Write a protein that binds this ligand. Structure first.
Ligand SMILES: CCCCCCCC/C=C/CCCCCCCC(=O)O[C@@H](COC(=O)CCCCCCCCCCCCCCC)COP(=O)([O-])OCC[N+](C)(C)C
Ligand SMILES: CCCCCCCC/C=C/CCCCCCCC(=O)O[C@@H](COC(=O)CCCCCCCCCCCCCCC)COP(=O)([O-])OCC[N+](C)(C)C
Ligand SMILES: CCCCCCCC/C=C/CCCCCCCC(=O)O[C@@H](COC(=O)CCCCCCCCCCCCCCC)COP(=O)([O-])OCC[N+](C)(C)C
Ligand SMILES: CCCCCCCC/C=C/CCCCCCCC(=O)O[C@@H](COC(=O)CCCCCCCCCCCCCCC)COP(=O)([O-])OCC[N+](C)(C)C
Ligand SMILES: CCCCCCCC/C=C\CCCCCCCC(=O)O[C@@H](COC(=O)CCCCCCCCCCCCCCC)COP(=O)([O-])OCC[N+](C)(C)C
Ligand SMILES: CCCCCCCC/C=C\CCCCCCCC(=O)O[C@@H](COC(=O)CCCCCCCCCCCCCCC)COP(=O)([O-])OCC[N+](C)(C)C
Ligand SMILES: CCCCCCCC/C=C\CCCCCCCC(=O)O[C@@H](COC(=O)CCCCCCCCCCCCCCC)COP(=O)([O-])OCC[N+](C)(C)C
Ligand SMILES: CCCCCCCC/C=C\CCCCCCCC(=O)O[C@@H](COC(=O)CCCCCCCCCCCCCCC)COP(=O)([O-])OCC[N+](C)(C)C
Ligand SMILES: CCCCCCCC/C=C\CCCCCCCC(=O)O[C@@H](COC(=O)CCCCCCCCCCCCCCC)COP(=O)([O-])OCC[N+](C)(C)C
Ligand SMILES: CCCCCCCC/C=C\CCCCCCCC(=O)O[C@@H](COC(=O)CCCCCCCCCCCCCCC)COP(=O)([O-])OCC[N+](C)(C)C
Ligand SMILES: CCCCCCCC/C=C\CCCCCCCC(=O)O[C@@H](COC(=O)CCCCCCCCCCCCCCC)COP(=O)([O-])OCC[N+](C)(C)C
Ligand SMILES: CCCCCCCC/C=C\CCCCCCCC(=O)O[C@@H](COC(=O)CCCCCCCCCCCCCCC)COP(=O)([O-])OCC[N+](C)(C)C
Lengths: 1105, 123, 168
């Protein structure tokens, strides 16, 4: 059969052919009509039975000879005499209507289908999400209309209640009653909840217009939506999405839904609403505008074990306005007022024509309903009762059902309704157990229910006591929420490449992941001795700063909205933002280096930049309050984040807006100075003092207080306690600005000598100038090896890889290597010939020198890059070379397109030679630079300098050259000008940021560079090394200064959020919309008062007479 | 004229990329010196005898539904972008303030005629 | 993926057909640059023969592309293909080449010193001018890059737009 439906669900065709009631209509002979008119008590004319078994009964006379002992005519049973056979129709109807087909579905099951098969039909066969709520509406059929007030509202709440809770709305479906009002409410809120509300019409296969159009095994039957006139039959309401048509009986009989629909209301409740949650799915009932068998149904749902609560919207119709008042004349759960038989049964007789023959039977159903009014919620329209029934529906499940507030809270948690819990569960006088609000916190975190975490923290959950090792372990291991698949990919890459079967994650492994992501020398609290010891042993089993540990959790689980929330709680907000930026950046990288499908490297790179911006914006806030305290924030050790600093974390994440911020640039400038006040001093007194040492004693140095915001070496901070004479020399020569000019003068003197060497004739032995040059480069080279093998990151292959990322270190490496090739050839060359330049090994050596010196003039751009104006232009030059590449490739092609024809036309008698490669490129290149070779253009002219080249075809080359230069100058050179004009500002801007950023690494370098410059640096190498055998900069703060700084951080974070709320609440767009909404509200009350004052006019009539 | 010409040229480059990439689906494997084999052989094999997307029926179902879903999102986001603009909220505010300014005065007249009550009722 | 299926996947990929044609084209230009720059004898050299084979078969390849395009009507197939800049130039390039080879190859040497025979010279000079078309077609290959390709399109647009300044 290739279908679970075809093999499971059935039809109910009336095989047995009871004649109609007894009597023929007319038409004296009783053989034609006893066959023709006389339908079956099934409910159809005799030939429609089409009994595969008894098809030949009608031809004879019929099944079941007439007389049959009248008793045995009612003996027909839907149970017995009805062959259970396949479905024969299950598919997809449509509804040509309000601009959409508004598709739907039907199964057309029998009736006595088991109850479980529905749940299996609904969830896997139809692929429907199990709901968190079930609204079972009821009422009467074929009523005209409602007040235009109530009509708009009932939907608005019914929709809201169902969309916010993923609810099912069980209707009859038929567009002659309850379903109509449901559907008419759907279209007023359609294309907003058209994919969250799965309404279901459990209607019969009886009363319906075109039962035969619904037929068809696996069909897409195009069902109508026009009210077929001249009839009473009803249509399936278009705006429903699912139908369970019930094949039984016949047309007209519509009673076979209570047995099935009710079971569905019973079987959904035995399902668990969520995995983490143990409560069953709730069921509610909204009766509007009802009838007599509804009042039976209301009491049948209240009396049930457990009770299904009830909503009653007064004024919709009889049963609503009735019950709303009939359970108003009563004690809370007891007896009625002064004898109420007259007025109650009066309306029960007026609404329902009874006359005491059925007027007690309803009143007896009423007095049972009032035994439980706590479950009959009633929506008092007029006096703004519970605001758009969603509260009234949902709170009815939270009104009296002797359910603990823990269960009242979880239910809101599964619904994702905070407003309900805060206003109706966290009510005054409410009382809680000890870890009920803890278990509710564990659920809200695992479920990513961020707004409930807020509600519980406020109401008094404490994360210091809540969070524990095993709980925090669980939060990583849960598969009951929006997990991150990639966390395991990072764990298995740090463990050994493998994983055990289930592998409940450990926190030491989380610690290992963070170290891999945070990189460098980051060592996490989870991989430390004490944690590694205590965890083996698993207040001791708490955490001192739990929101640092959950921020990490939320960021490794890719739970950003929870991360942002948790970030705003606790301390060290700027640091946490920078750690989050680094975690996400490193996660984004390994996602970009994994063959998985959902790359998530722009989602993570965007989350990194979101926290990156937060750190930058907190820095600006701090800088606007106090510059000196903001600079301290960049460099204080954190002690909860591996003793790093906020600036080092930002540099780790390559976060340029933070490092290029004027606060960070102000600090870097102060560290450049050292102890020197370079506001009272001038750069020429520094240079003068490097050459005149005794002038060091007449500079304006800085006090220990002026240095309070500046990180220092341990040796440098001990000489702050006082300024004696020898301390002042220390302060000078250890300042980075001094080391710079001290190395810059030595470098300039190095180039003057090396320029002298290459320009002056070279003898066998190197001159004194050449020896000094070699000493510089040798010791300069050792100095570079020192810098590499003492950098940061432990791993040589990472130290290597970072250092060779800088342009000038690649060039310096080439410069140093090429030099000693040159010195080797120059010095190692044996002179067999007395005239130098007869010895080629010598020449190759000298020519390497003359080319190696280019590297050393270009390194002056690195020194010049220390200036704020010059440095960006140096960075621009390299960026513009990269960007202009393809314009230059096109120019190179134009050059060859001219060069090859020119040479071929003018030199037709050439043999193969490498000079051909020169000649096709040489003159065409120099043409770009203002050389037209004027007396070579027309080689056959009298003024030609190439008269022997005159020959056939040579008249073509001036035309070629004219075209060539048009293309190069008039087009390509000016395109390049236009290129540079138009990208200048964006390249200059990027280059300023890069200049400012690379200023960190430059200034930090000169704190570890020796005092002495590269010729005399060898002493600082030998001595320092030898003194180490005989045996970074930190900010030092007093305990009171740590206090005042931690308070400064907190104050400025508070200012930061206040200024945002007040900037958003004061914008015109926000004031227009609050004005918009408040004018919307008034426009109701203005009219409402308008109606009241028009009904105080009713007073004027009655009062005055 | 650089920026407007560069912009037009990017669009034209991107557009002519269709015809360029489609061409290399029908070009022979072998390049133009050795392409003759792919000419002779292919021709001769034809005497001895475009790119399409293939979708399963379920994939056609899920794709036709995807198209419908995204068209619905498209109109919803327009109605909600227009009904949430300030210009549209100012004018609905304008018109509703126009309406109230009648009813405010109208109540103003009624309450001034419930003052007629105060006279007659108190005596 | 079996072994022989993987070769199919490679050689039928458009990116592979491109570099496979791009390397052949670059090797074609290296030879044709060699031919025009080196002295020319009576019979074409091995390098010149390979050059002729390329252009002949490259030309058949263009006729295939036209007579198998889309639109049934030849006069519409023709009209669209001659709308592209480089197909107009390729057409001129192919036609001019075989005028040149015809004069070069069909020329009878009455004189022993070449360049006494003008029909030969006209042939060789056509080659030396035809090769310009083939260096410029490299801009079509370069136009496959996202950065380079727009600049190639810009050059032609700017020539059109600068016309009247240049007339002045
Ligand atoms: C992180 C980046 C920076 C650091 C990178 C550092 C390492 C970079 C790499 C450096 C090595 C570079 C190559 C060295 C020369 C070999 C080539 C050559 O031609 O040699 C010649 C000299 O042969 C000699 O023996 C005389 C040279 C003396 C040694 C000077 C070079 C080594 C010093 C290194 C100082 C740097 C060390 C720095 C501190 C440890 C051999 O030729 P010949 O015999 O003259 O000619 C024979 C023909 N004849 C018949 C004409 C005679
Ligand atoms: C506005 C101002 C310009 C007015 C235009 C009017 C045009 C009138 C056309 C005149 C052509 C005739 C003049 C020369 C007489 C023939 C013989 C002769 O002397 O040949 C000379 C060369 O020249 C040639 O061999 C041919 C030149 C043809 C190109 C001329 C430009 C065509 C128009 C524009 C084309 C661009 C595209 C146009 C379309 C966009 C020989 O000179 P030689 O080199 O000294 O050779 C002798 C030495 N040898 C024996 C060793 C070799
Ligand atoms: C699409 C745009 C088209 C542009 C216009 C068409 C192009 C221009 C048309 C020019 C007219 C044609 C000139 C024919 C002259 C023949 C004379 C001769 O004997 O041979 C000459 C032709 O051979 C050459 O090689 C020179 C060709 C001129 C090149 C002009 C380049 C500048 C372009 C300008 C573009 C700006 C145009 C300005 C606006 C109009 C060479 O003379 P010779 O080798 O010395 O011969 C010996 C003679 N002697 C003994 C006396 C020394
Ligand atoms: C969609 C766009 C792309 C496709 C376009 C394709 C078609 C484009 C068009 C192509 C044709 C171009 C013109 C051909 C040459 C004629 C001119 C000429 O001067 O001839 C000469 C050679 O005459 C000969 O007979 C020898 C040449 C052999 C044939 C080679 C050319 C034809 C090949 C075509 C290959 C391409 C076919 C492609 C595949 C079918 C005659 O002169 P001569 O006798 O040497 O000199 C007499 C004087 N004497 C006394 C000094 C000796
Ligand atoms: C590593 C860091 C270095 C730092 C510098 C300090 C240490 C170095 C300082 C000085 C060393 C001088 C050694 C002199 C040796 C005596 C012989 C001699 O050379 O006589 C020359 C006189 O001297 C000159 O002509 C000066 C040549 C050096 C020019 C650069 C000095 C200024 C830069 C540095 C100072 C200012 C600093 C500027 C920056 C603010 C005469 O010529 P010759 O050379 O004999 O002729 C050779 C001809 N032959 C080869 C064909 C035979
Ligand atoms: C990483 C390390 C790489 C380099 C390793 C070391 C490479 C060492 C290389 C070469 C060592 C050569 C030793 C001698 C070999 C035998 C020849 C001989 O002795 O004499 C012959 C030398 O003739 C020449 O042409 C010598 C050229 C060699 C220098 C090449 C330098 C390459 C470095 C590039 C830069 C690299 C930069 C790298 C960093 C980026 C002839 O001399 P003669 O006897 O006077 O003959 C007179 C002839 N006459 C009659 C015509 C007048
Ligand atoms: C015995 C000898 C006696 C004489 C010794 C002394 C001689 C003189 C020595 C040296 C020459 C330079 C002196 C001028 C310094 C000006 C001061 C200044 O502000 O400097 C700046 C330059 O910072 C640098 O790093 C400059 C690097 C200089 C070397 C580059 C030379 C380029 C030559 C190639 C061209 C070819 C020329 C070749 C010529 C043949 C540093 O300041 P800043 O960082 O920009 O401050 C900005 C931040 N702020 C706004 C907060 C302030
Ligand atoms: C003897 C001759 C005269 C002497 C020469 C004069 C001295 C030399 C002149 C200038 C040198 C300028 C120094 C570099 C400045 C720093 C740049 C940098 O940091 O990285 C740049 C990379 O850089 C490049 O891509 C290339 C850099 C320029 C090389 C130019 C070589 C000269 C010849 C070339 C022409 C040969 C062709 C012509 C041949 C016919 C960054 O560019 P980016 O990728 O956009 O930005 C990323 C930056 N980030 C990673 C930091 C974020
Ligand atoms: C496409 C149009 C068709 C072509 C015709 C129409 C073109 C216009 C005009 C006419 C063409 C030139 C004719 C005049 C020259 C003949 C005289 C002569 O011998 O001249 C020379 C050779 O010249 C040649 O051998 C001719 C080469 C022509 C190449 C094609 C031209 C480009 C056309 C592209 C047009 C695109 C325009 C721009 C784009 C808008 C000189 O030879 P010689 O020195 O006397 O020889 C003695 C040698 N000896 C001493 C060794 C013995
Ligand atoms: C269509 C697609 C082609 C694809 C290429 C593969 C097929 C073609 C490959 C090779 C064919 C080689 C044939 C050699 C014939 C033997 C004789 C000979 O020429 O000897 C020469 C040696 O050879 C050279 O000097 C090389 C000349 C070719 C240069 C281009 C080869 C590189 C490009 C292609 C390969 C790399 C691909 C690069 C792209 C990534 C010596 O000179 P001559 O010529 O004897 O001198 C003539 C002088 N005369 C006329 C005055 C008398
Ligand atoms: C035996 C032989 C052994 C060697 C064989 C191999 C040798 C090397 C062979 C070939 C040289 C090229 C190699 C570099 C390729 C880089 C990769 C690349 O990205 O390419 C791009 C270039 O795409 C093209 O189409 C380039 C065309 C190249 C030919 C043009 C040469 C111009 C020469 C004129 C100047 C005169 C110079 C003349 C010099 C004398 C394609 O990538 P994309 O489409 O841009 O990607 C963008 C989209 N994305 C962002 C999604 C990714
Ligand atoms: C041996 C000599 C050196 C070699 C030469 C170097 C190689 C040659 C250099 C560059 C060639 C660039 C290739 C074209 C790029 C694509 C352009 C394109 O697709 O269409 C362009 C048309 O194009 C034109 O209108 C003209 C194109 C440029 C011709 C330049 C010829 C060179 C001489 C000229 C000077 C002679 C005067 C001076 C004489 C004194 C589009 O332009 P558009 O209409 O604005 O846009 C519509 C586009 N659309 C339809 C696709 C939407």
């Amino acid at each position: 059969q290739k279908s679970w439906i075809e093999s499971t669900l059935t039809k109910r065709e009336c095989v047995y052919i009871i004649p109609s009631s007894k009597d023929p209509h007319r038409c004296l002979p009783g053989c034609q009509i006893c066959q023709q008119l006389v339908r079956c008590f099934c409910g159809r004319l005799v030939k429609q039975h089409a009994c595969f078994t008894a098809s030949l009964a009608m031809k004879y006379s019929d099944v079941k000879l007439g007389e049959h002992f009248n008793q045995a005519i009612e003996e027909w049973s839907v149970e017995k005499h009805t062959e259970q056979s396949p479905t024969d129709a299950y598919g997809v109807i449509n509804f040509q209507g309000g601009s959409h087909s508004y598709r739907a579905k039907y199964v057309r099951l029998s009736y006595d289908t088991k109850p479980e098969i529905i749940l299996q039909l609904l969830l896997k066969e139809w692929q429907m999400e199990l709901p968190k709520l079930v609204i079972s509406v009821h009422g009467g059929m074929q009523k005209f209309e409602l007040h235009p007030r109530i009509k708009q509202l009932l939907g608005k709440g019914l929709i809201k209640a169902a969309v916010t809770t993923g609810a099912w709305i069980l209707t009859g479906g038929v567009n002659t009653g309850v379903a109509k009002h449901v559907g008419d409410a759907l279209k007023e809120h359609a294309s907003r909840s058209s994919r969250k509300i799965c309404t279901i019409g459990i209607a019969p296969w009886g009363v319906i217009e075109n039962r035969n159009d619904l037929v068809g095994r696996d069909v897409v039957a195009p069902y109508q939506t026009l009210l077929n006139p001249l009839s009473k039959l009803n249509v399936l309401n278009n705006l429903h999405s699912h139908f369970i048509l019930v094949d039984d009986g016949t047309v007209g009989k519509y009673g076979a839904e209570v047995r099935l629909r009710r079971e569905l209301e019973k079987t959904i409740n035995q399902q668990r609403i969520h995995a983490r949650i143990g409560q069953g799915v709730p069921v509610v009932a909204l009766i509007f505008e009802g009838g007599p068998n509804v009042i039976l149904t209301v009491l049948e749902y209240l009396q049930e074990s457990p009770p299904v609560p009830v909503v009653v919207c007064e004024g919709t119709g009889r049963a609503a306005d009735l019950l709303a008042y009939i359970h108003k004349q009563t004690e809370e759960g007891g007896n009625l007022p002064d004898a109420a038989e007259p007025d109650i049964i009066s309306t029960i007789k007026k609404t329902f024509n009874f006359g005491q023959s059925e007027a007690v039977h309803l009143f007896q159903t009423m007095m049972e309903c009032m035994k439980k009014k706590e479950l009959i919620t009633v929506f008092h329209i007029g006096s703004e009762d519970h605001q758009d029934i969603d509260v009234a529906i949902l709170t009815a499940l939270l009104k009296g059902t002797n359910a603990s507030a823990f269960d009242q809270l979880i239910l809101t948690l599964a619904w994702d309704r905070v407003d309900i819990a805060k206003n109706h569960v966290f009510v005054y006088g409410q009382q809680w157990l000890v870890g009920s609000l803890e278990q509710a916190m564990l659920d809200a975190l695992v479920m990513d229910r961020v707004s409930f975490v807020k509600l519980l923290i406020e109401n008094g959950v404490s994360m210091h006591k809540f969070l524990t090792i095993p709980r925090l372990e669980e939060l990583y291991n849960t598969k009951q929420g929006p997990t991150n698949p990639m966390l395991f990919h990072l764990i298995r890459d740090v463990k050994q490449g493998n994983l055990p079967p289930g592998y409940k994650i450990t926190l030491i492994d989380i610690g290992l992941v963070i170290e891999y992501l945070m990189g460098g020398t980051y060592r996490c609290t989870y991989t430390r001795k004490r944690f590694r010891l205590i965890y083996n042993s698993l207040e001791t089993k708490r955490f001192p700063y739990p929101l640092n540990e959950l921020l990490i959790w939320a960021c490794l689980m890719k739970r950003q909205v929870m991360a942002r929330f948790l970030w705003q709680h606790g301390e060290e907000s700027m640091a946490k933002a920078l750690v989050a930026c680094k975690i996400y950046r490193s996660m984004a990288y390994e996602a970009k280096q994994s063959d998985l499908v959902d790359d998530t490297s722009e989602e993570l790179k965007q989350y990194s930049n979101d926290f990156g911006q937060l750190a930058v914006e907190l820095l600006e806030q701090s800088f606007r309050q106090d510059e000196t305290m903001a600079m301290k924030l960049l460099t204080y050790e954190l002690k909860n984040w591996s003793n790093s600093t906020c600036l080092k974390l930002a540099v780790s994440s390559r976060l340029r807006p933070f490092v290029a911020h004027t606060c960070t640039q102000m600090l870097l400038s102060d560290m450049w100075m050292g102890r020197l006040n370079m506001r009272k001093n001038s750069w020429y007194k520094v240079i003068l003092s490097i050459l005149v040492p005794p002038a060091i004693l007449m500079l304006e140095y800085k006090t220990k207080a002026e240095m309070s915001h500046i990180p220092q070496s341990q040796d440098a901070h001990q000489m702050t306690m006082e300024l004696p004479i020898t301390r002042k020399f220390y302060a000078f020569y250890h300042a980075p600005i001094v080391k710079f000019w001290f190395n810059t003068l030595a470098y300039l003197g190095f180039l003057m000598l090396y320029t002298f060497v290459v320009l002056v004739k070279m003898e066998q032995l190197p001159s004194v100038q050449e020896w000094i040059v070699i000493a510089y480069i040798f010791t300069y080279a050792i100095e570079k090896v020192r810098e590499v093998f003492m950098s940061e990151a432990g791993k040589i292959s990472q130290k290597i890889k970072v250092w060779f990322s800088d342009y000038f270190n690649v060039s310096d490496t080439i410069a140093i290597i090429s030099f000693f090739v040159g010195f080797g050839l120059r010095f190692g060359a044996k002179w067999n010939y007395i005239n130098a330049y007869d010895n080629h090994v010598f020449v190759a050596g000298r020519l390497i020198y003359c080319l190696n010196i280019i590297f050393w003039y270009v390194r002056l751009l690195d020194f010049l890059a220390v200036n704020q104006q010059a440095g960006p232009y140096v960075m621009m030059i390299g960026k513009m070379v990269a960007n202009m590449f393809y314009i230059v490739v096109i120019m190179a092609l134009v050059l060859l397109s001219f060069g090859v024809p020119r040479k071929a036309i003018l030199y037709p008698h050439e043999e193969p030679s490498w000079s051909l490669a020169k000649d096709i490129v040489f003159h065409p290149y120099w043409m770009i630079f203002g050389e037209v070779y004027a007396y070579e253009i027309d080689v056959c002219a009298n003024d030609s300098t190439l008269p022997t080249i005159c020959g056939p075809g040579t008249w073509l080359t001036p035309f070629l050259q004219a075209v060539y230069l048009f293309v190069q100058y008039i087009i390509m050179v000016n395109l390049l000008i236009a290129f540079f004009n138009n990208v200048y500002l964006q390249v200059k801007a990027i280059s300023n940021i890069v200049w400012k950023y690379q200023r960190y690494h430059f200034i930090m370098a000169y704190h570890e560079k020796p005092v002495l410059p590269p010729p005399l640096i060898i002493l600082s190498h030998i001595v320092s090394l030898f003194c180490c055998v005989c045996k970074g900069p930190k900010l030092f703060l007093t305990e009171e200064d740590q206090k005042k700084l931690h308070d400064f951080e907190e104050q400025c974070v508070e200012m930061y959020f206040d200024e945002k709320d007040d900037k958003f609440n004061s914008g015109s767009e926000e004031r227009i919309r609050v004005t918009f909404e408040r004018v919307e509200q008034m426009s109701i009350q203005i009219k409402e008062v308008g109606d009241r004052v028009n009904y105080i006019k009713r007073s004027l009539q009655s009062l005055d007479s």
